Amino acid sequence: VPRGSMILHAQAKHGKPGLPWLVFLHGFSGDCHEWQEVGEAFADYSRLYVDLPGHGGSAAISVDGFDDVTDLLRKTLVSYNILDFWLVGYSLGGRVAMMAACQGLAGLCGVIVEGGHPGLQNAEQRAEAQRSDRQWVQRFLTEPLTAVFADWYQQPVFASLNDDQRRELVALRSNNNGATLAAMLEATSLAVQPDLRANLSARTFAFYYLCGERDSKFRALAAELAADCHVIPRAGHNAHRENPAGVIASLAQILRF
Ligand SMILES: [Cl-]
Helix, strand or coil: CCCCCCCCCEEEECCCCCCCEEEEECCCCCCCCCCHHHHHHHCCCEEEEECCCCCHHHCCCCCCCHHHHHHHHHHHHHHCCCCCEEEEEECHHHHHHHHHHHHCCCCEEEEEEECCCCCCCCHHHHHHHHHHHHHHHHHHHHCCHHHHHHHHCCCHHHCCCCHHHHHHHHHHHCCCCHHHHHHHHHHCCCCCCCCCHHHHHCCCCEEEEEEECCCHHHHHHHHCCCCEEEEECCCCCCHHHHCHHHHHHHHHHHHCC
């Protein structure tokens, strides 16, 4: 899609008429293929595998903040004539999902967030994040990505990963435009995201949390939310990648009931 595209790039897959859409949102540096292994177990549903700004086919789409990502999401949904939908988001995508849900997306059935941060409490926690994210923006923007990603996957959230998993992920994410990656990282930084705890409780939509059992960080964060948390065994932050069958199982419990 071009630089100034009104809608995000996404891969649509049609399912049974009358079943809601499953709108899948990848994490930072991923693309629309992220949730395809898990989503394809739900092929009776219509699936929208979105490319977030700066990622995959949405690489040229530029955003200032979350309001812009939400608008784009809204326009993309209208574009595919999606009125009944679920937002299934991993990490950055989970954060995008929660942000869009709390701004208000008409037709939203529910949000399923996997390792998504509900938001930091004060502007001090935000400052610490702005400082750390300003450092990441600079590296993605100027350095070779095989180098930035090797350290990115060395971050505490990815501690649970083995060196073979980190190798495969570094290679996979390095197929990206650092400049557009960096812009999105800055646009939707934890530093600029509000505390969504009250908003995620005072919701009109259904809300479910998924978490790898090894992801102690997001397990504790989930515990603070008014949501059904589904702890995915033998899995880290990206639980759908490490354990796709377990995440399908959890999604089946959620969606097929
Ligand atoms: Cl990842």
